[PDB]
Amino acid sequence: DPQYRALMGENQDLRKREGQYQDKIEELE
Amino acid sequence: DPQYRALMGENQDLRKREGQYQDKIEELE
Amino acid sequence: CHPRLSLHRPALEDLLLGSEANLTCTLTGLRDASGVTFTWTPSSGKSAVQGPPERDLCGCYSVSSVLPGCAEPWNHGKTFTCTAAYPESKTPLTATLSKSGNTFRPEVHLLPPPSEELALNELVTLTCLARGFSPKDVLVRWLQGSQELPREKYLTWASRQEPSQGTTTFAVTSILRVAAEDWKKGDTFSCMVGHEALPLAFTQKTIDRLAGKPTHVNVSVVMA
Amino acid sequence: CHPRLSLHRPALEDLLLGSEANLTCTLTGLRDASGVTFTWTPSSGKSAVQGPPERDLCGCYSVSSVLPGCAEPWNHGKTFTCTAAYPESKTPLTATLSKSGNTFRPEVHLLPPPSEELALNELVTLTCLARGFSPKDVLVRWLQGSQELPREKYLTWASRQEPSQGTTTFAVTSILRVAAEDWKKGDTFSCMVGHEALPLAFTQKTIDRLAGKPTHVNVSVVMAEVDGTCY
Amino acid sequence: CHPRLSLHRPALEDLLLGSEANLTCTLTGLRDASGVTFTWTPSSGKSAVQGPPERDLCGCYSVSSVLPGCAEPWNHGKTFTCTAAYPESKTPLTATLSKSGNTFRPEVHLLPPPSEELALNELVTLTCLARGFSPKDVLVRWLQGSQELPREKYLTWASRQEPSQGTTTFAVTSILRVAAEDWKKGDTFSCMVGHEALPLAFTQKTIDRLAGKPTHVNVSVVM
Amino acid sequence: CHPRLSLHRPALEDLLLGSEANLTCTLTGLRDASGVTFTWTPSSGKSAVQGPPERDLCGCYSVSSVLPGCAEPWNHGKTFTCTAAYPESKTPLTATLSKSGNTFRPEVHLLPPPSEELALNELVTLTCLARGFSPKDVLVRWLQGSQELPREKYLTWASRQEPSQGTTTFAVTSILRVAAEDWKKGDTFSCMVGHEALPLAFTQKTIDRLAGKPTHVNVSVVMAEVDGTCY
């Protein structure tokens, strides 16, 4: 229920998505 | 609490970063 | 020694995580005439408070005046002018201070530990770099997971000026050393930067193990 | 004001990349004039030079002296003392110094650019972090390929003391910003750290696009013959 | 020169590969006229005409006799003694001819190239060793697959007497250098030894790459 | 029969395993008697002994003479010019011998016993092959453990020049027979080859059952991503 846990979860999801996009950009080159 | 605001700012920055990643993948094709 | 009046802007730490704001106008190089009248043209809100002279330059009695409560006018864009007089001459001294524009946000990078550090089973180093911010004031702090850390655990350098050609910008760095067991377990770490130009005045970056590109090898043994 | 005497160690750059080991004795708190006399414990080729006075803070004079040609004793472990006597004095001032002990060799780490900087493809930052050495003095330089870049190209910070997990130590960081095309073409950049504790007074760490992480390497091992009368 | 008489034996190559194997009974050194009379005990009915009578090295004359009409069919062990007469004093001279037994079969070993030669990919040496035969008369030939190799493509040493405990035995060696690419390809190389004591008169040995199967190399990687 | 003169270089056994570089000069074709004379140009060891006039095949005469000397001048590259004065003619004929040039070093190989000879458990054959040397002189010796076997225990052939692969080269072989219970035990056998063209004049190769063909090999590959230093 606390805000900080939900914010941490959203941050982790965005970090994983950023890593996936990072992989995808490099694989194109 | 400054820490919560900092976490929100980091979330916004990561969202912008992944948006720019999407824009970068679009042009390369 | 030699008369001189200087104005100091409010400190960033109080402006960001504090409530009260200091506004300092100081005179140095008198060694006498303690009855110096520090008069501020924007005499609004609170009242000016004087302070006892202090030994400065080993030959002067530096006297400073503070105008607290001016955080809101300072942020709004009100220019502060400090006026004082000395008995040496009949010409009063006036100084001005105001906020500057063209503010750029910083770019923060958190770097994982070098691969040659994990082989010693000792602490590991994490570096946080803030770069490119125009105003020369910034504050950097750290978190392990959710619990903050005391200031006696990490080192930070002063915000120097970087060698560019386009515009003037500054950089700062800090390092935090953490237990190898904490790093390998899966605990995350973060570095937070606070600066004027940010809309929320606070951002941070987070690092944890097994994050990023995969690093597995593919070996082919032929044996002829 | 209050007279004082001090000694300034030779600059690190001069010692490492020079031949004049000048040690300077500085005197402050001059009253009205400069009729001081300086001397040192050794005198074999001690071409002491005083020079003209200067201007001090708040208004004051301060005349210092220098002593060159002392590199050999400095490295061998000698101790240098400068004693001065000014006319308005009753007891000469003294100062002493010697090479620092308990020195720790620095640990140098060259961190590849952050992964987010290599996608905007404008400029990339290489970070050189030297960590864990006892004396404060240190130097940082850079090389692209084999030719050093001009010192007006990067930003180096002052040496500072870090938190204690044992004995006392220091740290320094430097950064270089380089074109992304150069990085992605296959150029190699080296960071050179110069410190008295290191064996040959200098060390270097190199990095390129592939070093620092496997990230899907392809390794081939042949092992041609394995039953072949190994003698 | 000093007059003398000698008796030879058919060439091993002629014996095992030729149908014109003819013995020889020669008179080395002649200082008289055509007073040569040679007789051979066998009377099968062939021709025993005299060979080419000519001179020899350093002012010597010699007359030779052969049996061109016979292919030397003396497997049963005909003594084939030679009797010669000359116009000299009344002391006719003969020759010692017999078929000595004690026939031991050769043992042939074909050895692969040293591994050092295989690490440079230039040329590889194959060695043939024939050992343990009493009749010191053997011939070595080389084959690549089925095609034979000319005698100018390999080296062969003379047949020597190897040390032994009581029984006498002879040994001989040979080597052949072949292109490393062909050896790695997998072409088979054979050494053939021809000798009298053999039943078929020829023993063949073969070698090629991957001749050693039972080797059990094992591979495993860590981290 | 006919006059002829020849100079023979010293044997390799005396030259290498020693320093006696005796020289021999021989003439064939003596007419009626031994009224002949010899002359070398380095007349240092004037005591050149002349042997009896040995006969030849079926009425021929030959005369050989010996000039002693150490191997130092010969290795230095001197020249010798034996000349005969047989009475059958009034014109002497000369012969010249000097150290051979354009040399090469042998490539020694020591081969393990063949498989078919090991199942019978009677005796094993070790083969030594020296190859690719231009001069025709070479020495082959065998050793068991660290002791030299007597010369009557192994068989050595002679040097036959091999088919022309461009230039002129030679080859030699030898074999040794060893008790099978000794090879299986784990003793070591060495073949030593001596040539004039080798840097140290000798080269040995040692083999035993451990340095032979193994019946099982384990290969383990370790990947060290931290650093390469081979502790």
Next chain:
Amino acid sequence: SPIFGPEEVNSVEGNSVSITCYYPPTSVNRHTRKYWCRQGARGGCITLISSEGYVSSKYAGRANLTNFPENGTFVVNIAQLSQDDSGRYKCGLGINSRGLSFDVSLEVSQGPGLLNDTKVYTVDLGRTVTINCPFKTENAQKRKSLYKQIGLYPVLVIDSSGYVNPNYTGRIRLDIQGTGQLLFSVVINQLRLSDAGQYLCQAGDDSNSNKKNADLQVLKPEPELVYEDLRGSVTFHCALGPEVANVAKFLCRQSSGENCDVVVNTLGKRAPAFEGRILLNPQDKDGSFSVVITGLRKEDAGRYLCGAHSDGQLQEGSPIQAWQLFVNEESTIPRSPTVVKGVAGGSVAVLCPYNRKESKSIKYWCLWEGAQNGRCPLLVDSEGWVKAQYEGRLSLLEEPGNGTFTVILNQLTSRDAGFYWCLTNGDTLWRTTVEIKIIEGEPNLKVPGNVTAVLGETLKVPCHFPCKFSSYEKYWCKWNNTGCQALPSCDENSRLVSLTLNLVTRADEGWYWCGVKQGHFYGETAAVYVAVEE
């Protein structure tokens, strides 16, 4: 693998511990990183302290690490131990993941306290102990008994009437001294490992029962660590007390069978493996002797025990002292010929190495003599003394001079075969042993027999050499106690390097040497005695 240390460490709570670990003194080893870490079930050693300035949180204030590059050692000091400090630790160098380390085991046991009802007695193995058990004055003439609490039920070991348990017969006594003494004592000699345990005294079977429980523990000797190099030497100092100053001493090596294989005794014994490379010195007044072993091999590593017993072997009831030995095998000692063969009548030159850092020492040559406990008398020294029976055929030269000196011995005979030792005065003392043999043959250099001289007449002496001594330097020298020196006397082709004496006086008489040398290195020599008559 080259690292060493104490295999097991024992301590109780509250005390400090010190652990010394050894490495080869190579410069990389001196200047690299030394660490002390603790392993676990995860397989990774977690560094607890290092030499570069790191001190773990758990070890802050207590532990510290000191490196002694000259020694080749580094010491870890720990303080305020506890039951949690028990486990498996490692020394090491460089990186943790590599194998350059050594395993140690630490065990911490609970300390005593509040147990005043029971006493404690600690004695060394095979040493006498005494136990005083008071009895109440109410019991004047009552049986005094000692009971050993063994197994479920206690038994009797000694009474006051002369009944002694078989396990204690012949070495346990009971005393009740006079002079109005109302306390009795029990004295046990030649303590054994099984004699330790819980004892209880009793004064009669009356209701008084003035008992007093006591505890006894016999201590084992902690091994002393020794770290030596290959083909070097080791010295054992056996320093047992004067109480056994007149008993046969022995040195043995414990093996897998829990049974000493005697290495040396004092009754005239010796193993066949240590022929020519072992020495047992006489003992001093205190009762200590030394044992020297040279030419250390790969198999000289293990536990050694020196003791004093009547039969000269390891039996219970004899005090013992323990050493542990490590042979480095990463040695910097130069390799030299262990076997040197000379031909009867020829000569021999021996190169003896020493430490380059002690070039101003004194050098000695000795001949090992068996047929005793072991000995090594002197033959020649580097100062001008030579034996009376070796005059004219032995010399020492410091000619190479880069950590090596030559010894020349000619006129060989079949009696000269044996073992010879090279010694020096330095602190780092390698002892090098060379075995000289004799075979049949002829000398290379040829000189005439004994030469006579007529007073006031010129004399000439030849010295023929073979064809292989033409690229050398030929010399004639005059032998003297301080060494011979080349003369300015001639040469020729491969023969006849000659000595000339214009005028002969009585001083010219003596021994001369004709020899060859390659500038710095010496070779064969031949000795001729030049006399003078009238």
Next chain:
Amino acid sequence: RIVLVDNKCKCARITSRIIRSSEDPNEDIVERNIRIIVPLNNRENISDPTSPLRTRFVYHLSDLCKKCDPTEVELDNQIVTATQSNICDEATETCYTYDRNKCYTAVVPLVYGGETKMVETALTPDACYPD
């Protein structure tokens, strides 16, 4: 186990063992063990800018086992010095790993004021100090 060879130029260790049986030849076995350590962070030539990574490791058993040093042999009555290999080309081998006991240095040009100097850098700092 008898260590046939150890090699720091390429970090390869080869050992051999023999395990016989009471009965028959076939039961007897000879085993050879090969241990290879493959670095992944040093260059083709050991100098700073070279071939961003080395990814081709080639091991020849004949090259690993070579012994390029002389020896003393007593043949009949004298001692002779003999070589021990045919592959002893005369220091150019392409080593794959740094020897722990040897130190490797580079030379770099640095500008000091209005001049230029050639400074010496230590790639392996522990391997050799000025002693």
